[PDB]
Amino acid sequence: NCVADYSVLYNSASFSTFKCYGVSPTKLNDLCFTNVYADSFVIRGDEVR
Amino acid sequence: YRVVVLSFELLHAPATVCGPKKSTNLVKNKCVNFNFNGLTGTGVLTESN
Amino acid sequence: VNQNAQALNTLVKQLSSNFGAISSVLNDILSRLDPPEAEVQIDRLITGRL
């Protein structure tokens, strides 16, 4: 129940990893979804893979 | 390395989160590329009972 | 009449099969994936539907 602007994230150029599966990252602004229950944590770099 | 995973749910139900876009006018009885609630396609629309 | 109707009914229902693709709807793949990745899903639908 809120507007998702994915250009703010995608075009910020701070995020070293942008990996999208099943969806292209440039069309996230185009599709509407039921929900996007996001998750958050802190990990090591070598384990980001 | 700070990590967020965004899992998007694309199911057959009303959408809550949607990308920035502009809703336009509705044309009836004429062949149109249409997008209702994320459902995209091409066809003509008729009033239904 | 029954056999011919069954043959077409089976042909219609095969359109809802994924054949390994992420979605059986061709428009859903095009709206979600870029051509470098949208195509790979489409050949999976083309192979099954052909």
Curated annotation (Swiss-Prot), chain C:
Residues 1-42 form a coiled coil. It comes from the Viruses. Subunit of the fusion protein that is processed upon entry into the host cell. Mediates fusion of the virion and cellular membranes by functioning as a class I viral fusion protein. Contains a viral fusion peptide that is unmasked after S2 cleavage. This cleavage can occur at the cell membrane by host TMPRSS2 or during endocytosis by host CSTL. In either case, this triggers an extensive and irreversible conformational change that leads to fusion of the viral envelope with the cellular cytoplasmic membrane, releasing viral genomic RNA into the host cell cytoplasm. This is Spike protein S2'. It comes from Severe acute respiratory syndrome coronavirus 2. The gene is S. The chain holds residues 952 to 1001 of 1273 of the full protein.
